[PDB]
Amino acid sequence: PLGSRKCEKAGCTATCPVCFASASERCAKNGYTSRWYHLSCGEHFCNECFDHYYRSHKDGYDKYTTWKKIWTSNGKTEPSPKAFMADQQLPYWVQCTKPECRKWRQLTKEIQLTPQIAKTYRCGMKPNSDHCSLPEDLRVLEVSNHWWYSMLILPPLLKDSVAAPLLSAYYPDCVGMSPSCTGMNRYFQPFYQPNECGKALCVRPDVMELDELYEFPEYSRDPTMYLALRNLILALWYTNCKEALTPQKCIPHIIVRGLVRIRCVQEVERILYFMTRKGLINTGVLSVGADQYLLPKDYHNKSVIIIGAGPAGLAAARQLHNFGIKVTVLEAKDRIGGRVWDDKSFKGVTVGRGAQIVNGCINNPVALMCEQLGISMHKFGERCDLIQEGGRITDPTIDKRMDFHFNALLDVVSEWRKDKTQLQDVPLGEKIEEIYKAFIKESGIQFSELEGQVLQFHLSNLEYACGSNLHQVSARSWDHNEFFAQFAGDHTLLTPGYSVIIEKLAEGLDIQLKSPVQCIDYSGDEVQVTTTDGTGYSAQKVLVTVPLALLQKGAIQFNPPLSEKKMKAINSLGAGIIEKIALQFPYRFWDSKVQGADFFGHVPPSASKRGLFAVFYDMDPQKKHSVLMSVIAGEAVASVRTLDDKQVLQQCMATLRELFKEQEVPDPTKYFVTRWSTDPWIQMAYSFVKTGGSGEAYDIIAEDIQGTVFFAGEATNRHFPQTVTGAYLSGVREASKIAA
């Protein structure tokens, strides 16, 4: 009767507190003590065990001080006795893995929980009967109660998290890991480093993102538990991206003392499903069987028609199929891929007629997919000599000088734009030419004919990037996407081709080729989708991923029609265009002059030849086979429209013979010339912002109609326009919206 049997904590539901520490010879056990300390509704320790560590004259004080020091030196939270108890003394809980038992059990205080123990535990297991039949401790079912966590004192801190090696620059308790704790693909950098500049597809490990706050508002007050589990989940995905990450896989990696572990295990499942739906994990070319769908059955009860089987359409279809949702894709052409189309008949080389370069590999879904497929990319060398007609290699200082001036011209454009509205937008090309003449006139510096020709090369590089002569592109908005964090790291040639990724995304999906959509009717209960031959399809939801030019032409009839606001956005973007030529030779004639560089430039003879085979690419990085690819950009696409393939070839060969004037150039034995501009279902290479337009147009086009008609494709990605990467992510984006 001297002492208490009531917990210190007001509102606590523990009618009988027992001490979990039994660290002091004087432990009150289950009897009366001065004060019962409350870690949770089911966990308390007595006053003398408190004192055993807390007071200097007691034997557990030595342990407390050494822990307090470590906690203090690499931690941010207070090193209180409750914190010491929760980190070092609270006994572990583990769930029996027998499918028909599944009961939670407390381990004896000396046992250190490990992943292997958690993986295989069953009732009764010890390092040295009828154990499953014994009743489950009553405090377990209590953890489910809404209030349980609120009555828990300190947030859990994870031990030996798979995330820890990646977060060594953070204080562990800011990322939900314990301060007392002591060959991943180099393109996987999912976590921001402290005060590192923006990069694409990166999370702060210590801050919840907007969508995370939105889905789990209960964590806005204290995100520790969420952050620890989200970071763990991401770290697990990236350590093995070739298989689906499941709750069962995560649970053995959640290591924390106490009943709170139960709360953690109960939460990791919801967090995992969220990250799956959003496309952060369980993604890329991962494919899962009917018995292994990535989201629970409550997401499964819907049907989707996806129009177009390019990167965007296939990404969405792959995501939704993997989730367990019913998906049908309708593709106009006799092949899947869209602006991914590879030619594999070149001896020992894959040459893309469309996409083949990866711009920024760090965190790039394409790099993730290369890892999953076990394929290699080739990082481009820096060297690109500018070769003149006929033969002269341009002085690198001239190259660098004119590049500097071209960028200076762009810099003053970004000054001029600061006080202009869309109604005041001028062509970038017009504005450059104007500023150039103003600079030429003011300081009377005359550039040589060559310097002028090299400026022209640099100009053609920007026309190349935009897919247009710069007189059609917005001075205000040309580089709008740079406002957002962009993909860091290597620029690579995807040697095996994007087709390898496309084929994997598509495998096992329901895809209807040669089924060009002509009508989408969303006025009724289900969407009615009609092909050009009158074939009928229906689903609850429809995703449109057709190219921008095809929306601009109105090739698909929408009932009800698209809004004026959408039409204005659609028409405010440009349908950019480049074409490619590929040439196979009997031998590598360029080796003597090019000396293993990945590419060489071609200085335009005059303004009228700008963009006409500006850059040639050596298509075998192993330097064995002889294939060159070149590009036709800007005004040069026009000059080529009325030429047949033989004639384009002639001009290319004439160019090469001028570039390598001092030597013989063999005849090509195989070639292609692309005609994307006149491919009826494509009609372009990639989007750009036309004069008067805004980057916002990408968002407006991306906006769903009545949660019923959805839009994806490169021209719907404001952060990452133009690219296979951006198209892929737009598909992942829409799959998330659709699955919600």
């Binding site: 694409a200 999370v203 907007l210 496309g279 964090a485």
Partner: peptide
């Protein structure tokens, strides 16, 4: 600032 945020977790 949108110069930083994760594209897939900034959709709301």
């Amino acid at each position: 600032d949108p110069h930083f945020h994760h594209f897939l977790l900034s959709q709301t």
